[PDB]
Design a protein around this ligand. Sequence first.
Ligand SMILES: [Mg+2]
Ligand SMILES: [Mg+2]
Ligand SMILES: [Mg+2]
Ligand SMILES: [Mg+2]
Lengths: 48, 164, 209, 138, 129
Amino acid sequence: TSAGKVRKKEKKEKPRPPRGRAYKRLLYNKNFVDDTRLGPNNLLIRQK
Amino acid sequence: PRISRHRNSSKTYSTPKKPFTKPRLDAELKLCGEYGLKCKREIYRARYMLAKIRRTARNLLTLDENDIKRRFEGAALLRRLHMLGILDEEKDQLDYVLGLRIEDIFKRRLQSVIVESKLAKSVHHARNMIKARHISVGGQIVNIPSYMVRISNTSRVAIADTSS
Amino acid sequence: EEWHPSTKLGRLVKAGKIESLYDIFKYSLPIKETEIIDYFFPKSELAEEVCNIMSVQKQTTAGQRTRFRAHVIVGNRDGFIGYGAGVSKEVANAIKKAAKNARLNIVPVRRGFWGGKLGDPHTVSSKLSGKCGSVRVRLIPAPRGAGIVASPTVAKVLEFAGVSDVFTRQSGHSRTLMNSVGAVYNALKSSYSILTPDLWKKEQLDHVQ
Amino acid sequence: MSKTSGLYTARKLRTVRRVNRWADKKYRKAHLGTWLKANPLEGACMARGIVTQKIGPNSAVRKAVRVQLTKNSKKITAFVPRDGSITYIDNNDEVLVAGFGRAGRAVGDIPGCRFKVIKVAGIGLLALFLRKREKRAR
Amino acid sequence: VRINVLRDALKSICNAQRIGKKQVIVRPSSKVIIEFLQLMQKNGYISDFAVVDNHRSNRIVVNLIGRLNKAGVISPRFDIPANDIEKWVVNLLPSRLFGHIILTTSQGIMDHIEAQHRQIGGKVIGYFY
RNA sequence: CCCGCCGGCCGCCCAGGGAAACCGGGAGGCUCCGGGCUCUGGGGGGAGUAUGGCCGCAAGGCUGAAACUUGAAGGCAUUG
RNA sequence: CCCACAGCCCCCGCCGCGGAGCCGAGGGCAAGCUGGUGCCAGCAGCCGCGGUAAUUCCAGCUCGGCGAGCGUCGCGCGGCGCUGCUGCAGUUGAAACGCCCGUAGUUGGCCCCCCGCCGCCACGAGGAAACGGGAGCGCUCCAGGCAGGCCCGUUGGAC
Ligand SMILES: [Mg+2]
Ligand SMILES: [Mg+2]
Ligand SMILES: [Mg+2]
Ligand SMILES: [Mg+2]
């Protein structure tokens, strides 16, 4: 009946990424030098 | 009207007709990594220049060898390419021009000549040093990373005599 | 266990009597054994790709019967290309059949020069056209450094065939992959059957083979 | 063969193309003049008008509004897309109305709607739905 | 009615070659046909031919030896600038290496290479390769 | 009687062509895409409708829109 | 230092603020984890999602594109060989007037060895620059401008 009825976690304070060109450098070591695939749920289970 | 209306202006780069193409993305990223490129407009500028060279070479090649226009334009183009160092000295045929690639353009950048002289630890180190103004191209200090160095000045690119 | 040839050509190939695949193509012998192509390519120089995978259904008394059809190409990036198809109830066996069929049929691709003759050939010899279904393809020689001007699918074939510079034009319902690939394959196959004046030289036949 | 090909036949070719190029629906709609007069937007990017009433295989009712263009005085309906934006529009509020992606034609499952609402009281709808700005002045 | 004798002659020749014959007949015996055949013969496509008189549009006989793939005419003779030939070359012939385009000039019937050498142009008659 | 020539009406068909059914006395000689002349068509509806003009005793014929609407309508063929 | 006066660029000494957003993650189209709601609210250029795992809505995490720019709306070009001169189609998909005669119009077999005329091709004159192409010159590069060095083609600004 009430619109917006469907429409709390504190944000995780973590350091910002290295902007500028370093971001590209961050990707370069992300997949090639560092072991990859990406997107599995079980992969995040490893991350947690 | 104001005199400012007669100042000419034009763009200098192009964008790929198909943007999302995996091989192109990977190749562009790889070239950025080997040359420490900021954004992707520089590759577009390089491709623009290469396209101009190739089109001129084609038009001259369609014509006869003994065409006066052919002689004139080819001589000018060869002289410019050689003075820039992009094309090897031993080559003086217009046919070789069609085989040039943007990598030869990159190799004559200020960062490139700086690094291959072993004057810098890396492309990123070279860029940061260039910004701080520690380099004296010829006898004049230059703070433009994309400055292109001719053959006659490659032996003359040194450290700034004023830098600490 | 081992490869026991089932054909005279297979036996001769098992023996070191035949030394090159071009020695086979010159007399238009049909190929039926997949072992023959690996013997000339011991190190597995040939590449492989899976262009498409589609599902085909047949109506029956009880529900539907489904199946899978696959298209595969292979090449060593140096004047050799092949196209093949396979259909089966399961995807993997269909892919294996398609790869086997593509390996079975293979043709050489002739290459030439655009204007200046310097170094190795870099593009097609001349204009080539092919026809399959509603699709038509035109291959035009190009200058050095021009890249491959074509759609991603056709460019894959031209890459696996060992070309670097070429212009292409397409017509018809190009969204049908099988017929586009077939048309380009036919155009490439026609390459070595096109007379040119340098081949006007009159050569006497050879009794051997 | 079918077409003329003589060396002194350019006039006929020009006339034939002139006559036959009117058969295309797009060319007609663009160069004929009927649509421009019949379009309540008269070739403009978007219009400024005044709202006067709120109304709304998929079975979801879409929220829209009836509007009258200031410069034209003809009536149309424009549809407010972004969630929760019905409450942000009040009766008799100045609005700016543009078009959907398909010029002229209807878009999506919405019957009889061919426009969009992008501003109310001078504030972008997107800037308000994300809470960047606020409509406290109205 | 009959108009372009050259087109009919060329079509007959190509049809005969397709089934690998050796001798053909062509009713018209125009001068333009004769020069076209002369150029073909000199370049090495058709070898020999003879003209058979009869006082009523003489007939001509030609011999075949393969080689020839295609040959046609351009029905309305365009005007070709001396400097505007590469476009036609690319549009019509398979490759820039081989092939001959026939142009009629004030200097006589010649091939596009010859005219390119003399830096002059004219009207186009046909082509073959 | 059988061996031919011209013209006409037909059947089957190698190549070739085509999305295919099929054509093959061309629907062949065409993306390798130019013999000459004329006419018609540009997604489906609204609509061969309205409004004008001409012809006709009349019934009606020739010419011939737009607004608006819509995401498919169609061709040949395959299995049930 | 420059400037009609002031700024501003640049040079010189002292102290020294390091800051990225806009779109999207089913296909076209590069880019995936829980909580809500339940054909409601909403997304969606097209196909489509949502009637209890919602890979498409609403939030968090993660990820991708471009980048001091990003996205939306309308118009033109291209996409388009869907206006087709190059270069469409006309048995069955939309499309050969029911047939004949016939004027304007368009198109017209072969042949003459050198004369005149029209078209045609090449060259030339003559006539504005800017823009465009283009020779040469390191405004720190560049967008630009026609400069500039010492012992300069009469320094150059050609075409
Ligand atoms: Mg045609
Ligand atoms: Mg059409
Ligand atoms: Mg219609
Ligand atoms: Mg029909």
